[PDB]
Design a protein around this nucleic acid. Structure first.
Ligand SMILES: [Mg+2]
Ligand SMILES: [Mg+2]
Ligand SMILES: [Mg+2]
Ligand SMILES: [Mg+2]
Ligand SMILES: [Mg+2]
Ligand SMILES: [Mg+2]
Ligand SMILES: [Mg+2]
Ligand SMILES: [Mg+2]
Ligand SMILES: [Mg+2]
Ligand SMILES: [Mg+2]
Ligand SMILES: [Mg+2]
Ligand SMILES: [Mg+2]
Ligand SMILES: [Mg+2]
Ligand SMILES: [Mg+2]
Ligand SMILES: [Mg+2]
Ligand SMILES: [Mg+2]
Ligand SMILES: [Mg+2]
Ligand SMILES: [Mg+2]
Ligand SMILES: [Mg+2]
Ligand SMILES: [Mg+2]
Ligand SMILES: [Mg+2]
Ligand SMILES: [Mg+2]
Ligand SMILES: [Mg+2]
Ligand SMILES: [Mg+2]
Ligand SMILES: [Mg+2]
Ligand SMILES: [Mg+2]
Ligand SMILES: [Mg+2]
Ligand SMILES: [Mg+2]
Ligand SMILES: [Mg+2]
Ligand SMILES: [Mg+2]
Ligand SMILES: [Mg+2]
Ligand SMILES: [Mg+2]
Ligand SMILES: [Mg+2]
Ligand SMILES: [Mg+2]
Ligand SMILES: [Mg+2]
Ligand SMILES: [Mg+2]
Ligand SMILES: [Mg+2]
Ligand SMILES: [Mg+2]
Ligand SMILES: [Mg+2]
Ligand SMILES: [Mg+2]
Ligand SMILES: [Mg+2]
Ligand SMILES: [Mg+2]
Ligand SMILES: [Mg+2]
Ligand SMILES: [Mg+2]
Ligand SMILES: [Mg+2]
Ligand SMILES: [Mg+2]
Ligand SMILES: [Mg+2]
Ligand SMILES: [Mg+2]
Ligand SMILES: [Mg+2]
Ligand SMILES: [Mg+2]
Ligand SMILES: [Mg+2]
Ligand SMILES: [Mg+2]
Ligand SMILES: [Mg+2]
Ligand SMILES: [Mg+2]
Ligand SMILES: [Mg+2]
Ligand SMILES: [Mg+2]
Ligand SMILES: [Mg+2]
Ligand SMILES: [Mg+2]
Ligand SMILES: [Mg+2]
Ligand SMILES: [Mg+2]
Ligand SMILES: [Mg+2]
Ligand SMILES: [Mg+2]
Ligand SMILES: [Mg+2]
Ligand SMILES: [Mg+2]
Ligand SMILES: [Mg+2]
Ligand SMILES: [Mg+2]
Ligand SMILES: [Mg+2]
Ligand SMILES: [Mg+2]
Ligand SMILES: [Mg+2]
Ligand SMILES: [Mg+2]
Ligand SMILES: [Mg+2]
Ligand SMILES: [Mg+2]
Ligand SMILES: [Mg+2]
Ligand SMILES: [Mg+2]
Ligand SMILES: [Mg+2]
Ligand SMILES: [Mg+2]
Ligand SMILES: [Mg+2]
Ligand SMILES: [Mg+2]
Ligand SMILES: [Mg+2]
Ligand SMILES: [Mg+2]
Ligand SMILES: [Mg+2]
Ligand SMILES: [Mg+2]
Ligand SMILES: [Mg+2]
Ligand SMILES: [Mg+2]
Ligand SMILES: [Mg+2]
Ligand SMILES: [Mg+2]
Ligand SMILES: [Mg+2]
Ligand SMILES: [Mg+2]
Ligand SMILES: [Mg+2]
Ligand SMILES: [Mg+2]
Ligand SMILES: [Mg+2]
Ligand SMILES: [Mg+2]
Ligand SMILES: [Mg+2]
Ligand SMILES: [Mg+2]
Ligand SMILES: [Mg+2]
Ligand SMILES: [Mg+2]
Ligand SMILES: [Mg+2]
Ligand SMILES: [Mg+2]
Ligand SMILES: [Mg+2]
Ligand SMILES: [Mg+2]
Ligand SMILES: [Mg+2]
Ligand SMILES: [Mg+2]
Ligand SMILES: [Mg+2]
Ligand SMILES: [Mg+2]
Ligand SMILES: [Mg+2]
Ligand SMILES: [Mg+2]
Ligand SMILES: [Mg+2]
Ligand SMILES: [Mg+2]
Ligand SMILES: [Mg+2]
Ligand SMILES: [Mg+2]
Ligand SMILES: [Mg+2]
Ligand SMILES: [Mg+2]
Ligand SMILES: [Mg+2]
Ligand SMILES: [Mg+2]
Ligand SMILES: [Mg+2]
Ligand SMILES: [Mg+2]
Ligand SMILES: [Mg+2]
Ligand SMILES: [Mg+2]
Ligand SMILES: [Mg+2]
Ligand SMILES: [Mg+2]
Ligand SMILES: [Mg+2]
Ligand SMILES: [Mg+2]
Ligand SMILES: [Mg+2]
Ligand SMILES: [Mg+2]
Ligand SMILES: [Mg+2]
Ligand SMILES: [Mg+2]
Ligand SMILES: [Mg+2]
Ligand SMILES: [Mg+2]
Ligand SMILES: [Mg+2]
Ligand SMILES: [Mg+2]
Ligand SMILES: [Mg+2]
Ligand SMILES: [Mg+2]
Ligand SMILES: [Mg+2]
Ligand SMILES: [Mg+2]
Ligand SMILES: [Mg+2]
Ligand SMILES: [Mg+2]
Ligand SMILES: [Mg+2]
Ligand SMILES: [Mg+2]
Ligand SMILES: [Mg+2]
Ligand SMILES: [Mg+2]
Ligand SMILES: [Mg+2]
Ligand SMILES: [Mg+2]
Ligand SMILES: [Mg+2]
Ligand SMILES: [Mg+2]
Ligand SMILES: [Mg+2]
Ligand SMILES: [Mg+2]
Ligand SMILES: [Mg+2]
Ligand SMILES: [Mg+2]
Ligand SMILES: [Mg+2]
Ligand SMILES: [Mg+2]
Ligand SMILES: [Mg+2]
Ligand SMILES: [Mg+2]
Ligand SMILES: [Mg+2]
Ligand SMILES: [Mg+2]
Ligand SMILES: [Mg+2]
Ligand SMILES: [Mg+2]
Ligand SMILES: [Mg+2]
Ligand SMILES: [Mg+2]
Ligand SMILES: [Mg+2]
Ligand SMILES: [Mg+2]
Ligand SMILES: [Mg+2]
Ligand SMILES: [Mg+2]
Ligand SMILES: [Mg+2]
Ligand SMILES: [Mg+2]
Ligand SMILES: [Mg+2]
Ligand SMILES: [Mg+2]
Ligand SMILES: [Mg+2]
Ligand SMILES: [Mg+2]
Ligand SMILES: [Mg+2]
Ligand SMILES: [Mg+2]
Ligand SMILES: [Mg+2]
Ligand SMILES: [Mg+2]
Ligand SMILES: [Mg+2]
Ligand SMILES: [Mg+2]
Ligand SMILES: [Mg+2]
Ligand SMILES: [Mg+2]
Ligand SMILES: [Mg+2]
Ligand SMILES: [Mg+2]
Ligand SMILES: [Mg+2]
Ligand SMILES: [Mg+2]
Ligand SMILES: [Mg+2]
Ligand SMILES: [Mg+2]
Ligand SMILES: [Mg+2]
Ligand SMILES: [Mg+2]
Ligand SMILES: [Mg+2]
Ligand SMILES: [Mg+2]
Ligand SMILES: [Mg+2]
Ligand SMILES: [Mg+2]
Ligand SMILES: [Mg+2]
Ligand SMILES: [Mg+2]
Ligand SMILES: [Mg+2]
Ligand SMILES: [Mg+2]
Ligand SMILES: [Mg+2]
Lengths: 92, 97, 102, 66
RNA sequence: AAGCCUCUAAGCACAACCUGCGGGAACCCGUACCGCAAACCGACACAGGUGGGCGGGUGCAAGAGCACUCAGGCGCGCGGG
RNA sequence: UGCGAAUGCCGGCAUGAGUAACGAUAAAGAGGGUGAGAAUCCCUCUCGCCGUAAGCCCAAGGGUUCCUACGCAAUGGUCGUCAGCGUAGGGUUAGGCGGGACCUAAGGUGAAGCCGAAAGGCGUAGCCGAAGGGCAGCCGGUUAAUAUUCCGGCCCUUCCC
RNA sequence: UGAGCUGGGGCUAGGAGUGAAAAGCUAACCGAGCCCGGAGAUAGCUGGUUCUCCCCGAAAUGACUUUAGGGUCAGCCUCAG
RNA sequence: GAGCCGGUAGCGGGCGUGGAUCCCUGGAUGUCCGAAUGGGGGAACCCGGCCGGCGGGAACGCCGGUCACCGCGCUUUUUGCGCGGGGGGAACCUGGGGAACUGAAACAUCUCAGUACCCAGAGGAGAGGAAAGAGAAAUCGACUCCCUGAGUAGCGGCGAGCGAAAGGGGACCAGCCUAAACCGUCCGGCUUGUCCGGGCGGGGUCGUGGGGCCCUCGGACACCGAAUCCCCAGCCUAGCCGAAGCUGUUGGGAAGCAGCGCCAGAGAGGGUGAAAGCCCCGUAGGCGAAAGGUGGGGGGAUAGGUGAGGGUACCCGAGUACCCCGUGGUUCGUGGAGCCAUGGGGGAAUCUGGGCGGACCACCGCCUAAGGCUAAGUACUCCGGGUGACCGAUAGCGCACCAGUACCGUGAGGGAAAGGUGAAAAGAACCCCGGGAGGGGAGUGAAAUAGAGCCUGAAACCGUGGGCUUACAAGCAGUCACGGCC
């Protein structure tokens, strides 16, 4: 289920800029708690997590003619890997 | 809740009829009605404090069925519970079947 | 669910329409539109895609579907209605003369 | 088809082992996601199979506990 | 009313609470932008309405007044004759 | 089952009419740029108006309106190359800020209990209830867009052992 | 500086509330809010009532009527025998 | 039984005769809210206790499980355990409450009306139901429902108006359990007993009165038998088989016309380029369930049921009958006012007892109150189906179309518009003008004033062209004449 807490990497200039320091950002499950995301990343990428920052990302309203709807709400975690470590899976 | 705990008599609805004129059976042209309106008739509810086992029990009953409380008090047989012996004295001991 | 009386393999003859008479192998069956595509009713699509793959190319000549009713199956004879016969497993389409394909 | 085999393999195979196997496919899935995430680095139909395959183990796990 | 301090009761007093040091642990929600207004209440990019804080300088008896002005912001979403 | 009328009903199109008006009399001018197209977008200079504001920061309420790229059919009282508009992508980071694993206020709810044809109405404690009480973060740097939230420096709180 | 103004949180309402009293106000019309319903209330009043041809063709008086611009009987029109 | 990964093409991939998609049955999973039920709360959020697990894991967090309240029953008030309730449902049903407009051509009794509506409760139905009944016949026999009786009998400011029952004809069909006397038993109270009381069992259930107890006869294999259990048929929830035509011709297209045929337990109907019994789907006629539901039908069990005579006088439902006051129900509006119901007061009896036959009395009869259950015939239609001298997009549901939506309203609530190219997208490559839009050729088509603001395309309304006409004439605009010009 730890591979259920972590959904996908957030791919953006801002996100990439985070790699410089030990800071990797992920799309996580919206109900997932900071404490849960530590362990989730801890056991997913064999790393020591030290700080966890999260924030909700409201869905953007979009229409396709006549019918207007909304995209799913999301949650981003920016995770702080311990000094010297690295997620190689994201370094690409 | 203006209802007898023993007979179950509860308030009923009845008309108040205003009649006037001399009866026909008295050489009058007959009676005339100047109004009919609804009203309640409540049963003559009263308190009955009666000591049972070690406890004081209070029944809200129609004056008519007060005797029934004391008859229900005669039936005695092991019961050191709370102020809720009536729960036992009640229908449990009323007609049961 | 859309009975349908001819399959991919079958050898059908176009019983009516413009290609009345022609005989062909049904390439595709389309139960949703209740239609089959054989070798008759083919048309001229204006192939825009000058830009993507298929450059220059002005047109194309794909074969359009046919109301499934517009065709009939055949075998050592003309077209047939279909009769279904029970064996000792399950049934099979036999024409009103012999049998239909291996 | 290729599936009935896996179903037979899964059945008759401990719950602890089943949970192990699930946790595994669950991880593979995450990887399928990340590939798809960075686009052009995946081939759909696999995300569905696996997702649906993880369901099959979990339902057999259910039987074996029921 | 709690935090807080003190008092003692059951209990417990190789517990416990107090002080100091050390290591570790510290969750959920909000956070964009508008906000005297074209983004809020008034069918409108509506001369109306909307609570708290800051609100510089010079002069004028004083002042948040008046005139001119900093920072900053505007010439108001049809124009020409 | 026959419509011309019901200030009839629904719809369409007329007249007034190229008429009133284009929403504060704070105010405009030129050069250059972009572009199919420019009084209306960009830049420069000059001019004018606000300045206890028409500047700035909070709380409501609003809910993508935010930043950027590509766009002008419509929305914009004109025009638009521009936009708070269309498409797409990005953007909101907290033990210390606010609220909650704190407190109580009016009031609300309500074990006990009381009352009422039914629905239900009361009501002690308790509980809920805040812009009140309580409680530990100040100065800078950084992004197109967040920062007492990220970073840097210095500084504290509670919990567990 | 006061019977002052104002944010936030609350309570009171339809024959009811609230009112330093105007029958004021109770969501832009209050001598009794709004919504749905009884409901197609009732309207002796007003308006409207749709193809064609043929024959005949009135009344606006009398009686009574809480009746008087409404009716009942008669009078006058028409049809059948 | 050959195609499939919904509407939905496409990009990018996959699956299927080793039987996929799809359909039916059963199961699994089923976040959060909601009766909502650990506790809060501004529903879909927030915060916990206990046991167990996961992470380095005490602090933190997550996962599984468990914890609301009320009732009944056991049980030792202990403290637990078990069982159940709660909420929803188109209309239908019963109960508790209960209007007004209106009608009376005013209005109060009366009416509207026990309607609307509110509340509680029930279930596929609900109510009712086995005579303390009817009511004049020595009569009938539970209840419900229809027809009739009958707009009768009556009620009524005797106004407006309201309006029974018996009886007859039908549908359906059914009858049972208890309380008490008496007997046994367990238990509790005590002023200890052939005592009282509660709990269970037996007993008993009736109106030609029945039962208890005592005696006599003879009291049984039986005989009846479920509304309960069991089995089965049948039915519902997917399906399957299902006759008989080719050719020519006009045409874009045949099913039209023509030539010879054929089926019919099938000549209902709908498709296919136009008008098809015989091309497609069906139709007549048959067939079909592993699984779940049903099962009122057949079968089988079980519960249960069944005697005569004599004596005894033990029992036969109490704050009840009965009477009176206040009211409701009935057609009965106080009437000569009974009957059924009952808020208040008084207050019995147990077959020689009690109620009723419309005040009361007598006589003659009917029936056995104060406990309970009971299928079917009946009501409704959210739902599935079949039919139409039913609608056909201003109709028909508000909605043929992603409508209880957009939008309006603080809210309860209100509430629309909006269908159609073609047989087939063959939905117009390319070229020209243009920034696009749009158009012009080309091309598709039987048709392109069928080009997607697409079938037909009326009227108002706006244009372009042409004929006649008009700047010394004046009027409901027409009409009758003449004359010109086209
Ligand atoms: Mg946060
Ligand atoms: Mg009276
Ligand atoms: Mg007399
Ligand atoms: Mg009345
Ligand atoms: Mg008495
Ligand atoms: Mg045939
Ligand atoms: Mg098979
Ligand atoms: Mg406290
Ligand atoms: Mg001390
Ligand atoms: Mg001690
Ligand atoms: Mg420390
Ligand atoms: Mg730390
Ligand atoms: Mg921020
Ligand atoms: Mg900000
Ligand atoms: Mg602005
Ligand atoms: Mg601002
Ligand atoms: Mg202002
Ligand atoms: Mg301000
Ligand atoms: Mg501003
Ligand atoms: Mg403006
Ligand atoms: Mg304004
Ligand atoms: Mg505005
Ligand atoms: Mg003013
Ligand atoms: Mg102000
Ligand atoms: Mg100052
Ligand atoms: Mg100054
Ligand atoms: Mg000064
Ligand atoms: Mg001077
Ligand atoms: Mg001065
Ligand atoms: Mg100041
Ligand atoms: Mg000033
Ligand atoms: Mg300036
Ligand atoms: Mg302006
Ligand atoms: Mg007319
Ligand atoms: Mg009209
Ligand atoms: Mg239109
Ligand atoms: Mg004018
Ligand atoms: Mg003018
Ligand atoms: Mg003007
Ligand atoms: Mg102006
Ligand atoms: Mg220039
Ligand atoms: Mg240029
Ligand atoms: Mg200029
Ligand atoms: Mg310029
Ligand atoms: Mg300007
Ligand atoms: Mg806000
Ligand atoms: Mg937007
Ligand atoms: Mg912007
Ligand atoms: Mg731009
Ligand atoms: Mg535009
Ligand atoms: Mg424009
Ligand atoms: Mg414009
Ligand atoms: Mg405007
Ligand atoms: Mg441009
Ligand atoms: Mg935009
Ligand atoms: Mg910090
Ligand atoms: Mg701030
Ligand atoms: Mg806090
Ligand atoms: Mg905590
Ligand atoms: Mg509190
Ligand atoms: Mg209360
Ligand atoms: Mg209550
Ligand atoms: Mg209650
Ligand atoms: Mg709290
Ligand atoms: Mg506070
Ligand atoms: Mg505070
Ligand atoms: Mg704080
Ligand atoms: Mg500091
Ligand atoms: Mg900013
Ligand atoms: Mg800063
Ligand atoms: Mg810092
Ligand atoms: Mg004061
Ligand atoms: Mg105030
Ligand atoms: Mg009122
Ligand atoms: Mg008042
Ligand atoms: Mg006042
Ligand atoms: Mg007002
Ligand atoms: Mg009515
Ligand atoms: Mg009236
Ligand atoms: Mg005539
Ligand atoms: Mg004449
Ligand atoms: Mg009149
Ligand atoms: Mg007359
Ligand atoms: Mg004659
Ligand atoms: Mg799809
Ligand atoms: Mg494909
Ligand atoms: Mg293949
Ligand atoms: Mg099979
Ligand atoms: Mg299923
Ligand atoms: Mg299931
Ligand atoms: Mg809860
Ligand atoms: Mg634990
Ligand atoms: Mg849990
Ligand atoms: Mg129930
Ligand atoms: Mg219910
Ligand atoms: Mg309820
Ligand atoms: Mg009732
Ligand atoms: Mg009722
Ligand atoms: Mg009730
Ligand atoms: Mg009633
Ligand atoms: Mg009335
Ligand atoms: Mg009438
Ligand atoms: Mg009247
Ligand atoms: Mg009248
Ligand atoms: Mg009147
Ligand atoms: Mg009545
Ligand atoms: Mg109900
Ligand atoms: Mg039935
Ligand atoms: Mg029934
Ligand atoms: Mg019953
Ligand atoms: Mg009986
Ligand atoms: Mg009888
Ligand atoms: Mg009389
Ligand atoms: Mg009546
Ligand atoms: Mg009868
Ligand atoms: Mg009969
Ligand atoms: Mg019978
Ligand atoms: Mg005894
Ligand atoms: Mg007994
Ligand atoms: Mg018995
Ligand atoms: Mg018995
Ligand atoms: Mg006897
Ligand atoms: Mg067939
Ligand atoms: Mg056939
Ligand atoms: Mg030809
Ligand atoms: Mg032919
Ligand atoms: Mg022929
Ligand atoms: Mg037939
Ligand atoms: Mg045609
Ligand atoms: Mg046709
Ligand atoms: Mg024909
Ligand atoms: Mg014909
Ligand atoms: Mg046919
Ligand atoms: Mg023929
Ligand atoms: Mg059949
Ligand atoms: Mg079969
Ligand atoms: Mg069958
Ligand atoms: Mg079965
Ligand atoms: Mg049977
Ligand atoms: Mg049987
Ligand atoms: Mg037996
Ligand atoms: Mg005997
Ligand atoms: Mg005897
Ligand atoms: Mg009896
Ligand atoms: Mg009597
Ligand atoms: Mg009497
Ligand atoms: Mg009476
Ligand atoms: Mg009465
Ligand atoms: Mg009277
Ligand atoms: Mg009378
Ligand atoms: Mg009477
Ligand atoms: Mg009466
Ligand atoms: Mg009598
Ligand atoms: Mg009576
Ligand atoms: Mg009584
Ligand atoms: Mg007698
Ligand atoms: Mg009688
Ligand atoms: Mg008599
Ligand atoms: Mg009397
Ligand atoms: Mg009788
Ligand atoms: Mg009985
Ligand atoms: Mg029943
Ligand atoms: Mg239906
Ligand atoms: Mg038709
Ligand atoms: Mg329409
Ligand atoms: Mg319609
Ligand atoms: Mg039409
Ligand atoms: Mg409907
Ligand atoms: Mg409509
Ligand atoms: Mg819809
Ligand atoms: Mg609105
Ligand atoms: Mg709204
Ligand atoms: Mg159309
Ligand atoms: Mg079509
Ligand atoms: Mg067609
Ligand atoms: Mg060009
Ligand atoms: Mg063209
Ligand atoms: Mg052409
Ligand atoms: Mg052609
Ligand atoms: Mg043509
Ligand atoms: Mg053309
Ligand atoms: Mg045409
Ligand atoms: Mg057209
Ligand atoms: Mg056409
Ligand atoms: Mg059109
Ligand atoms: Mg057509
Ligand atoms: Mg057209
Ligand atoms: Mg012209
Ligand atoms: Mg002259
Ligand atoms: Mg002249
Ligand atoms: Mg003139
Ligand atoms: Mg004239
Ligand atoms: Mg002439």
């Amino acid at each position: 289920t730890a591979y259920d807490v972590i959904l996908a990497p957030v791919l953006s200039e801002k996100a990439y800029a985070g790699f410089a320091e030990g800071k990797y950002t992920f799309w996580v499950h919206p109900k997932a708690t900071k404490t849960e995301i530590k362990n989730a990343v801890e056991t997913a990428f064999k790393v020591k997590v030290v700080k966890v920052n999260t924030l909700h990302v409201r869905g953007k309203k979009k229409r396709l003619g006549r019918y207007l709807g909304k995209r799913p709400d999301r949650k981003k975690a920016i995770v702080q890997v311990a000094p010297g470590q690295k997620i190689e899976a994201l370094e690409g | 809740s203006k209802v007898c705990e023993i007979s179950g008599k509860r308030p009923i609805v009845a008309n108040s009829i205003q009649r006037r004129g001399k009866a026909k059976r008295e050489g009058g042209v007959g009676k005339k009605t100047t109004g009919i309106s609804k009203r309640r008739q409540y049963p003559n509810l009263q308190k009955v404090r009666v000591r049972v086992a070690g406890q004081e029990i209070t029944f809200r009953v129609a004056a008519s069925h007060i005797p029934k409380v004391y008859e229900l008090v005669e039936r005695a047989k092991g019961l050191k519970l709370e102020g809720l012996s009536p729960k036992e004295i009640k229908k449990e001991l009323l007609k049961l079947l | 669910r859309v009975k349908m009386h001819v399959k991919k393999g079958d050898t059908v003859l176009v019983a009516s329409g413009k290609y009345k008479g022609r005989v062909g192998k049904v390439k595709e069956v389309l139960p949703k539109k209740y239609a089959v595509i054989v070798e008759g009713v083919n048309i001229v699509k204006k192939a825009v895609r000058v830009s993507p793959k298929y450059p220059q190319g002005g047109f194309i000549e794909k074969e359009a579907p046919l109301h499934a009713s517009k065709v009939r199956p055949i075998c050592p004879a003309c077209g047939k209605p279909t009769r279904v016969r029970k064996k000792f497993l399950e049934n099979g389409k036999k024409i009103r003369v012999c049998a239909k394909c291996g | 088809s290729e599936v009935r085999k896996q179903l037979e393999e899964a059945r008759k195979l401990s719950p602890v082992e089943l949970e192990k196997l699930v946790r595994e496919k669950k991880r593979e899935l995450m990887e399928l996601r990340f590939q798809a995430s960075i686009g052009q680095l995946s081939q759909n139909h696999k995300i569905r199979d696996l997702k649906r395959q993880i369901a099959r183990l979990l339902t057999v796990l259910n039987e074996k506990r029921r």
